[PDB]
Amino acid sequence: PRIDMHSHFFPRISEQEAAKFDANHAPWLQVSAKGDTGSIMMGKNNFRPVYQALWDPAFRIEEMDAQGVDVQVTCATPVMFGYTWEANKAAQWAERMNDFALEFAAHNPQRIKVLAQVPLQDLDLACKEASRAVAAGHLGIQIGNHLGDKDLDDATLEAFLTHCANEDIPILVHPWDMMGGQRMKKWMLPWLVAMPAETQLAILSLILSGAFERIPKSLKICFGHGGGSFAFLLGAVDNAWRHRDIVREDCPRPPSEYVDRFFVDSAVFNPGALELLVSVMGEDRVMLGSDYPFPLGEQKIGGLVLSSNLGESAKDKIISGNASKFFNIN
Amino acid sequence: PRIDMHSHFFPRISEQEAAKFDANHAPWLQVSAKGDTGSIMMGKNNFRPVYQALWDPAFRIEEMDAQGVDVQVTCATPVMFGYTWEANKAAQWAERMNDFALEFAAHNPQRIKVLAQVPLQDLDLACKEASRAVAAGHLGIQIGNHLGDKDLDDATLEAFLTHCANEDIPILVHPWDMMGGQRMKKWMLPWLVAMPAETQLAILSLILSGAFERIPKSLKICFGHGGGSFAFLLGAVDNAWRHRDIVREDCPRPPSEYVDRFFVDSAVFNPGALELLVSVMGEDRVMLGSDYPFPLGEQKIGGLVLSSNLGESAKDKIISGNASKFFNIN
Ligand SMILES: [Zn+2]
Numbered sequence A, B: 001p002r003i004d005m006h007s008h009f010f011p012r013i014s015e016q017e018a019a020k021f022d023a024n025h026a027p028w029l030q031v032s033a034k035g036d037t038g039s040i041m042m043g044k045n046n047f048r049p050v051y052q053a054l055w056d057p058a059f060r061i062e063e064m065d066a067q068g069v070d071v072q073v074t075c076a077t078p079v080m081f082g083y084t085w086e087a088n089k090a091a092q093w094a095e096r097m098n099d100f101a102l103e104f105a106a107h108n109p110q111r112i113k114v115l116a117q118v119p120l121q122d123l124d125l126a127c128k129e130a131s132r133a134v135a136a137g138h139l140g141i142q143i144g145n146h147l148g149d150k151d152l153d154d155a156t157l158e159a160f161l162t163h164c165a166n167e168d169i170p171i172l173v174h175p176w177d178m179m180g181g182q183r184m185k186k187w188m189l190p191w192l193v194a195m196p197a198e199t200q201l202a203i204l205s206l207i208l209s210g211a212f213e214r215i216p217k218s219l220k221i222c223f224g225h226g227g228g229s230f231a232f233l234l235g236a237v238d239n240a241w242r243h244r245d246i247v248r249e250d251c252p253r254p255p256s257e258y259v260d261r262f263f264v265d266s267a268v269f270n271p272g273a274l275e276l277l278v279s280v281m282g283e284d285r286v287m288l289g290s291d292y293p294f295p296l297g298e299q300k301i302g303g304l305v306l307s308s309n310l311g312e313s314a315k316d317k318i319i320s321g322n323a324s325k326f327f328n329i330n
């Protein structure tokens, strides 16, 4: 079947319910009276216009049919993370969101799988939430790729990964809270420039810090959006490792050898980019992700893989094989 | 014949010559009695230790012999920019670095060419410095993407491109200066992540702002380092342009259609990445650049292009053809 392992949801939360958590920074969902469109709010502010398939599981199915998608793995919209909040409030939030997801998916748990969020600022509460959420349904965890000035090499984030590997919980790493600051507002530049750099930073943070050495090889970790610009700029990285002390210091093998340690989704929107990606990662390590139902995710899901010059077996693993093994969908 | 269009020098200046500009911001060169070592200086502290090839054309002429390199275009180390300085002092400084670059060049003007630097913080001072310098023999200009602490590139910058496009003054745009704030502190991550991003941002800035519609097709502009991650991320840009009216707002054609308006150098350190780059830019708009003499410079200049499953006609254009037309070199 077709397995789309990168999609998003947003739960039914009213302004008042989100107010209890944080009347200013807790997101919620404003739906039209018809019920077809809607907005993600943020206190009183409009954040991002959305539509029915983000909150409605039934309505999501009828698009899951038209696109030929059999099983969808879905998870929190990044605005729900709340990594900057006080920890207990966040842990409570993350528990409530993971509950909403199970509800969402339970409409038809055969086709809709979910991933959990965690209060990643607090290592203890994050591990607790991850175990709890998986035992209760979720097939794994989605996290943002960094926590303020902390990247995946931070010991707190490295310890979370280790915990997930110990308990055989699979992780999807998603870019969010993009760098760039004031210079990238127009033309969705944060999406096009900062977001792939964020992801590539995350991957390189694990590799060059030595982290993969101190993390069990049993960890299932996947990077969204093709690993960003990772696969393309990897040559420049091997070259820096070869010729600079400071680059080599904590990384014992050539950085390129580490593609055996993680996965990437397939959303790179270009036949040749996909072929370089598969070349670097191997057909075993790339999975179909659409970024549904957001405006700039692949509009015909799986379109790019199937239209490619890849072997029938390579097209099968990517569209199905690798995510049945990765998330243990049978 | 063999042309490396991307390299760097630093002038033969003393603590005192530079003192007359600044005691703690104007950089100068210190070399030991064993005239082989050397180090760039700021005040009385080491800013950057330095290979003998960086200053001293004599040694350079010999390394160009060992390498396949007949002609090498060379320019400022971005340390020498000073786009933060007051517009007048930075006009004085600029021209001195361009005289210092003409004495360097006049040690073999058949083999050593020079690009000028401009006081880009003031539009007219820079325009004047530019015309003045190409007239003195410089084959063109090298500019950063900022202003020491700047947000990208407005219509002031677009004017400077127009000035150059009209007097046929070629420009090499060189990624420089940060992006990562308090992140990316180890393993040369700014060079591996932030620098490719900066370059791709410069490119997309020109394209998505519609700038190429106001800029005469006469413009000769090259982007350092393979144009960063541009080629690989292009499919994503195109996808966004077509699914979001804000991306398309100032950009009347698909962004990918604009590849005919600029050049990139070839320094991407990987045959697969170079093959995608050529397939996107076309063999006519990729030139050989090594980043000599820096430690992350290509070791065997030309090596990656020569060794490629590319075409032979393609290989001569890259090595020679394109950079002959671009700088006007015979
Ligand atoms: Zn996503």
Ligand SMILES: [Zn+2]
Binding pocket: B006, B007, B008, B174, B224, B291
């Ligand atoms: Zn350079």
